[PDB]
Every structure is written in structure tokens, then in C-alpha cells.
Design a protein around this ligand. Structure first.
Ligand code: VU3
Lengths: 205, 206, 206, 205, 205
């Protein structure tokens, strides 16, 4: 207990928080989606509600330590407020995202961080043809709101969304769910922007 | 009031907060559910709303004291923000949980903590057959979001949910309610994962 | 303004906040309800919404002062966040209570505190028979969530709920509204538990 | 910018916040309503929703300064959290009031404060007869929750609610809107209770 | 990293926050709208819900630095709470605006600030004729709530709202969307007030 208290004090109370990446020191953020349920479909407003959990991973040199100096502690859990977290947001949401899980991250001695928020998201989708055999395709882009591809490099481990935790008695059946890295340009900035496109094909069970 | 002010100052202002359990220092958390009401059933979205209070108890050596050194004070009440609390959550919720009670915990001189938040939860459940004699079975898993079974040992005193405070004029009658501890070794890694599966069998009152 | 600034500084900046009552130093809290309106009745979920004022009164020796030492100031108003407040909650609510008034309390030189939050509460009630001449009876208990009768002694001035401020053009007419103090004993602990049962008999106007 | 930074520091960092009025030092608060729209009417719950802005004015000696000592600055804007604000509330609301504007106040060198929060309020009103030619009359009292007329003297500039900003394509048309000050006296206590009774007569367009 | 941590410390911890503009030191705020979707239309309450990005740009001398003194850092990202932000609000909203993006701003070495909050707004609009070929015209004014045209000079880059990110499968089709600067005079003091009128002509798809 004493060694962990000493580690947290040395990492967070001694030095200031990580101020975010720069062009000279970019950061790689790996995203992964686990789709739990398509809760609601609104044909009158063209909104679809998803329940999912987003796995986020990044590495910081400022969060590194030698386990031998801290009673062989290799990892710990801390409030997400105690550390820097990437500004990953849905680009086509219609309501503020609702958090369904505790905001706690796991820090490893090599500086690796894992943050897995469970969320409910309302996003822009026309559900016409959901009642058919062919179904309907919905798509939402996830990315850093303010950091370009020069500061935050977004990645996926696989393009396959995890559907092993998908609610078996859901109103909607998943036909396909993919997560793809895209490099986009905007009438904003000449720098490239990176997003992860979550594409879900579904129909009424 | 002076002895309690002195105790709170010695326990919270002198030392930093408990940083959570580790594999070398695991923590046992006892979980208990008291079901008060099945408020809403949504057949179009497959959501069911429960009102219940979740009893949580754990013991910390850092929260121990000698009552004789603090005017024979054996226990006290403090804001849940002043102490560490386990990250126990519903794994299949559809809305952020709503708190219906003050966020205050009871600390005993032996280091025991009791925190009983009253909550309204919307979770995933197909209520088809609720209008029948047989009823319908809903299930929701509770556990630590970030800690494994090597850090947090989640347990239940009984597998029976307390139904003594269940609303008598509820729209739904409950037929059975169990709280069972489950160990899931199947995930990735050699570490086990623990959860309390709250299983409720219910039907429309008649 | 200078004398009040000096008083608030001496009462709040000099000493830490009151840490709550103990068995050795209990606190009496007087509770009173002023029913303003029965806003909503939900026959499909068995929820009833009330708008009421909850008068709360307690006395603290730490909040006492001599008016002669502070320019003859006998009382003042302060944010409820600057002082300790009792954890009085509804035992059968279905939604987090909504606050409709500023969270400010009145402190008197004898240490008396007056806190009257205006609230909207959704609680468990079957409103079947509200459309009848006889009406329907709803009940909701109020009490400390974590303190027993040995730490917080809950009291009422009267058995009657103040209906003088009840909305005259409400959808529902009040036939009777009582607030009764109840002492309960549970098998698990020897301490008595106190609650105020708010019982309201009402029907659809005319 | 330097003179304003110096003024704010001298007014807020040097001295503690105004502790509120007393019987010996009473404060006059001038209240004014600008009705923007009657959004919703609920015949099943007897609730009416208004969108309006509430002009509040008071004067404090602690907020006075000599413009000549601060680069001829006669007034400034500050967050409402930096200053004391009166506890003016609706006495018959059914939902917590929703704030539609930034919580910023204007302070003048003579100690005058102007705070104009834009709000959405749900209050108790039977709207039976709104669909008729005669319309319906709704009333809602506003006043200090904890201060009596001996501490806060509530006033109005006019009896007329400002309707110059009322939404022209509203579902409901305003037939009359008064803003009248009332004194309530009791036999028990010598303390008067002051309120501003906002009375609105309206019908469906 | 070290140079950025040093820059943020020198800009925010050394000096107090920007206290806002004055008549003697006015500020130009550039406003731009990117309409993403007309989510909801409520014919019973006369409310229309929009999802848009509000680009805000201003320049402060207090936020200037020499990149050469800070490891050639030309820009950075910081929480909107760490800096002053203009009180730009919708004048005819019916609900508190909902934020759909992280509250982070970009600061450039010349003192330029870019803040782009993504929002969901419910505002006053009669949607009668939306089901027709001609459609319906909705308008909503945006401006500083407490600052006059003598303190905050509101500007636009173009008269045209960015519709390149408008949801293609929306329930409503955009016929025209303009953002125009207006100098209006209110019932208060003789100082002019500036706004940006967002006018949207739309119909059912
Ligand atoms: C402490 C002191 C005052 C108040 C308010 C005073 C103004 N009243 C509207 C009219 C009113 C009723 C009423 C009932 C008891 C005593 C004084 C009262 N004044 C609303 C309550 C609240 C808390």
C-alpha cells in the first residue's frame, strides 16, 4: 500500500501533468470498439443509439518507472482525472455522450495507459430498411477534435469490432461491424486529420 | 464534536488517500442487493428500470483507530468523496446510473466501511412474456470495471436478494431474485475476473 | 457589512466544519412539510410527482455567538455548502430529487439553523381510484440515510402537513396530509431508527 | 488590459465577498422581465413553460472605484461566481430553472451591478381556456427565498413586462403581461415579505 | 514535453487570466457556422433542433510568444477553462445548449485562439410549410450577451454557412444557409450591439 502511495506521489505530485503531444513529439493512440447493443432507432429524427465500450491505448515516457524501486509494482489503477486523456469524440453525435462506467485508467511501468469508457451514443443515422432482410448501414467517425495527424496518430489493432459481448436478445441483429482508420482533409487546416470509421450493418431480429 | 474533528483530521489530512488494492494486497468487497421496485419495462427498446440499494463493505488498515484515543468514538459518517470507493458497476446498463440517496459512508474503528447507495438503473432486458403466468427472467452482472480477481475479491453473504422492502403496489411481481458470484477465467490472461450476477424473475402483478 | 464579514470569518474560517453527530453528542432535527402541488400521476409506472418545501431545523453550539460582540447581529444567511446539513432523504423515490430553490440557510446567534429546500420528488405510488370520490392514499417515509436515532433524533412540530400554500388550480385535490414520526427496531442492530411518514390522501379535483 | 486586471485584483482578491444585506444595511434589488416565448402548455399536469430574461440591479459600496485611478475604466464584465447575487426565485416552479445565457454580470464604478440571466421556467398554471378568444391568465411570484423586505427591498421600474422581444411566430399570443410589486404582512411578525407578481394573459394564435 | 510545459507555465501561471475587452481595448471575434444536421422539428411547441460547429477566433497580445525561446513551438492545445472565452450565445434558444465536443482550444504563437465547440441547439422556429416545395425559413441571432459593439466586434469570414459536413440522409434538406453580421440597437444604453444572424431555409427530404 505504502509503495503504491509513494509511486503515485512521485508520478503525479512531483511533476506537472503531460501537456499533450506536439508535431516534434507525436503520440500514437490505438482504438478498439466492443459493441454491446443498438438500443434505439428513431425513424422520425434519423437518430440511432449505441451502447459500446471504447478501448483506448497510448504510451508516455513521463508515466514510466522501475518496478524494483517501488516494491515490484508493474501496474496500477488511477482516476482518469489524474492523467492526460486523448480528446477522442464522435464527429456525428446528436446528444452529449453518456458515460456508463467508472472513469479509471490502468497505468503500466513502461508508461502504457489503457482507458476503456463504456458509453451510450446518439448519432446521425437513417434507419430506413432496418425492417428488411438486407438491413441498413450506419457509420460514425471517431477522432481527436483538436489534434491533427501530426500530433495524434490514430490506429486500430484490427478492423473487426468485438461483437462477443453483443446483447443476444437485442431488437437489432448485427450483420457486420468494422472499424477503419481514415486520413481526412478539412477546410480548416492544411495538416492531415485521422479518424476511425465505425461502420455497422444491422436489421430487426 | 472536538474528538471526531481530531479523528477525521488524523485519518484524512495527515496521510494520502488509499490508492486501491494490488495483487500483493488484495481487497475483499462484500456486495448485497435490496430490490425496491421494477419501475419501467420498455418492450420497444428492451430496457428494464430497477430501483434498488447496493450494500458495499470492505476493510482498510489505514482507516483503523483506537476509540480510547478519540473519546470512545467507535464509528463515524463521512462523504464518499473523502474515502476510496470500489469501482463496482453494472456491465449491461443503457443509461448512467441515477443516485437516489446521499453519498455518505460509515467508517468503524476496525477499518470497516459500509456504503449503501440507492440507485435507479436502466439495463438490457427483453421483457417478452412479462404479461404471462411464467413471467420473464432478467439478468445484470456487477463487478469491478478495472480490477481483476487478484486485486478485488468480490463476494456475497447470501445468493438471495433482499425483497422485504419491495413495493407492494408495484406493476410487476417478483417470482425470484438471486445474487450469485461468478468467476470468469476465460478472457485472455491467467488472471480470474469476478462478478455478482443479479438474476430477477418477474411478471405483471395480478 | 464589516461586522457580518467578521462574524462569518470567525465562525467558518477559524474552525473546520461540524463533522456530524455521534452517540455521545446527538443532534435533534425538526422536519416539516409544506405541500405545494401534486404535479403528475403515472398510472402505467405507479409514480407520483410532488412539489413541496422541506423545513429542516437543528442547533449547533459551534454556530453560537454574542450579538453585542458583532454589532447586534442576531442572524444571517449563508450558502448551505458553508455548513453541515442532515442527510434527510425519501426512502421510496424513483428519480433523484430536484431542487427548485436557492441552497441558502439561516443561522441564528443561539446556534439555530433553518434550511428550507423546495423540491420535486417522484416516488412509488399506485394512483388507482384517484378519479373516484374516495380518492387514493400515497405514503413516503423520510429519514437520515446513514444516521440512527442515537445520532440524529428526528422530530416534527405538528402531525399536519402545511396545505396553506397548496396550488388552488391543481389537477388533484388534497383530502388529508399527515407527517408522523415513527420509531423502528431492526434485528441486525440495537439502535432505534427514526423516520417521518408523509401520508397524502388525494383525488382528481371536483 | 493591465488597468482592468489591477482593478479586478483590488476589488476581489484584496477583500472577502459581500456577505449579503442586513436589517441595518438594506439592499434594494430592481427586477424586470422580458418575455421571449410561451414554449409549452401542459393541460394534463397544469404546467406552463416560459422563456424570458430577468434583469436584476443592485448597488454595493464595496464594488465602487475611482475611474481616474484605473485608466478611466467606468465599467467591466465579470463571472457571476466572482460576485454576490440575490437569491431571487419563482415561488411556484415545478422544475429546476434552466439557464440559457452566460452567467456574467456588468459592474459600474459607482458600485452598480446588472445581471440579466435568460431562463426557461416550468411553473404551476391551469391552461384551461387557452384555445378560446378570452384566453387564460397565469401568475407566478418572484422574490428572495431567505431575505425579508427588511433586508432585500424588491422594486420594478415599470408595471409592464417587456414584450418587444416576444417571438412573433409563437404558438401563444400575449393579451397582457404585468410585473406588479406586492407586500405581504402578517400579525405574528413585523417583517414584510416582498414579491413581484408576473401575471400573463395569453391564448393560442 | 519540457518546452511546452515551460511555455504553458509562463503564459498561465506567471500572469492573471485575460479580464475581457474594454471600450479602450476592443476585441474582434470571428464567427463561423458548420451545419451538420436539422435533427428535430416540433410543430406543437415551435422548436427546431440543430447540430452544428461554431468556429470562434480572436487574438490576444498576452498569449503571444517567440517560438525560438520555446523549442520552435508555433502552437498548442489547452483546456478552454485555462483561457478566457467570449460569451457568444444564441438569443432565441429554448433549452440550455448541449456540448458535443471536448472543450479544448488551439493557441498560436501570434496570440491567435481557435475554439470550435460542437453543439445541439433548440431554438424558436415555426416550421409550418416544411412539408412543402418552398420549405420554411428559420433564423437565430448569435452575439455577446453582455458586451456591446464597442467591446466585442463580431465578424464572419463568409456569408455562407459551411454545408460540406451536412448529414446526406437527414430528414430535412437545406435550400440555403447564411451567416450575416447585423448592428442592432436595444431598449438599453446608446451603445450598438452586434450579432451574426444564422438564417436557414429548409424542407422535408
Ligand atoms: C425562511 C424564511 C422565509 C422564507 C420564505 C419567505 C417568503 N415566503 C413567501 C411568503 C411567506 C410564507 C411564509 C411562511 C413562514 C414565514 C414567512 C413566510 N413568508 C416564501 C418562504 C423561507 C425560509
Amino acid at each position: 500500500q505504502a509503495n503504491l502511495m509513494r509511486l503515485k506521489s512521485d508520478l503525479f505530485n512531483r511533476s506537472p501533468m503531460y501537456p499533450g503531444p506536439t508535431k516534434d513529439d507525436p503520440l500514437t493512440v490505438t482504438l478498439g470498439f466492443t459493441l454491446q447493443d443498438i438500443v434505439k432507432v428513431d425513424s422520425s429524427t434519423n437518430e440511432v443509439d449505441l451502447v459500446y465500450y471504447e478501448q483506448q491505448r497510448w504510451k508516455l515516457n513521463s508515466l514510466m518507472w522501475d518496478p524494483n524501486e517501488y516494491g515490484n509494482i508493474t501496474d496500477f489503477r488511477t482516476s482518469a482525472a489524474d492523467i492526460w486523456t486523448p480528446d477522442i469524440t464522435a464527429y456525428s453525435s446528436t446528444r452529449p455522450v453518456q458515460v456508463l462506467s467508472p472513469q479509471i485508467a490502468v497505468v503500466t511501468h513502461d508508461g502504457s495507459v489503457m482507458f476503456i469508457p463504456a458509453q451510450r451514443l446518439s448519432f446521425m443515422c437513417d434507419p430506413t430498411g432496418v425492417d428488411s432482410e438486407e438491413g441498413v448501414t450506419c457509420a460514425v467517425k471517431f477522432g481527436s477534435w483538436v489534434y491533427s495527424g501530426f500530433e495524434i496518430d490514430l490506429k486500430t489493432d484490427t478492423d473487426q469490432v468485438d461483437l462477443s459481448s453483443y446483447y443476444a436478445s437485442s431488437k437489432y441483429e448485427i450483420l457486420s461491424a468494422t472499424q477503419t482508420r481514415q486520413v481526412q482533409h478539412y477546410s480548416c487546416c492544411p495538416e492531415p486529420y485521422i479518424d476511425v470509421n465505425l461502420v455497422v450493418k444491422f436489421r430487426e431480429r
